[model samples]
Target: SSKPKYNPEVEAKLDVARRLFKRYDKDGSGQLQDDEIAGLLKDTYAEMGMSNFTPTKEDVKIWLQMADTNSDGSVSLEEYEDLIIKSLQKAGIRVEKQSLVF
Candidate 1:
């Protein structure tokens, strides 16, 4: 049996995902808590110009549960990546690596 080869494009996306997760992990716990999730969602809403949008504690919990694949009550980086990619795809968003032209 042969091991799988590394794919630069996929690895790049994974790296991006790790950086994004760290940004949301405000407590530096390596796992995103409910408060962190709420904060991230709030920021997203504001960034998208949805000023009237507010997420309640329960809402944040539900969102966390959706991404907490291990039922660990928190989202790890791996789970975060899965959730992010799936959500983006559902929203018709595609992430691609940019080519260097310099």
Candidate 2:
């Protein structure tokens, strides 16, 4: 089967994610390294306001393992997008098509 049509709203969110990935990719390597993962998780935890949420090195390791779908030792933009979408869905946020031109 072919891929589904792209939704404009979803594309907008993916654009945001792309920008975020660029911001976190400090060395401009295109992939997020271990240190970048730590920074990303730290910022995410802070933004979520989970004061008790502390991630250890092992936690970062596990996240990298889980998010690195292609086993390339780093998270690519596509992988990062998947991670963000899953995280948002887990947090009860809906990712759906919407009319942006209306």
Candidate 3:
């Protein structure tokens, strides 16, 4: 089978994700490391009902580093979207969006 392609809607959300990550990066380094994403995931998981299952610092770091496709010490916008789509697919959800809020 062939790899899936990102449709227009996913592309747009990817842009938003880039911006959001940039905004949260604080240092404006254009890259979110394991520590940064770990913080994000911890809070996010808390809200999503996994309050007690936070990823370890090492776990988060390893995951982020593995996802960094360009080897630039960071995951780019497209890479971020790919990770998201993969996770959603693993959860048995199709990653298709009809609209964006912002």
**For this target, which candidate reaches the highest lDDT against the unseen true structure?**
2
Candidate no. 1 TM-score: 0.46
| Candidate 2 Cα misplacement greater than 4 A, ranges | 1-7, 41-67, 96-102
8 in model 2: Cα distance from truth in Å? 3.4
Query: Against the hidden reference, what TM-scores do the models get?
Result: 0.46, 0.54, 0.48
lDDT per residue for candidate 3 within 4-26, as digits (tens), equals 35667444434444556665666
lDDT (Cα, 0-100) at 42 in candidate 2: 59
Worst 10 residues of 3 by lDDT: 43-52
**Whole-structure CA lDDT of model 2:** 0.57
Model 3, residue 17: what's the lDDT? Answer: 48
Pairs that clash in candidate 1: none
* Model 2 vs. true fold: TM: 0.54
Residue by residue across 50-99, what tens digits does model 1's lDDT show?
Answer: 34446456444554576555475666665655444433333444655444
Give the winner by TM-score: 1 or 2: 2
What is the alpha-carbon lDDT for the whole of candidate 3?
Answer: 0.50
Between which residue pairs do clashes occur in model 3?
none
* Candidate 3 Cα RMSD (Å): 6.5
| Order by lDDT, highest first | 2, 1, 3
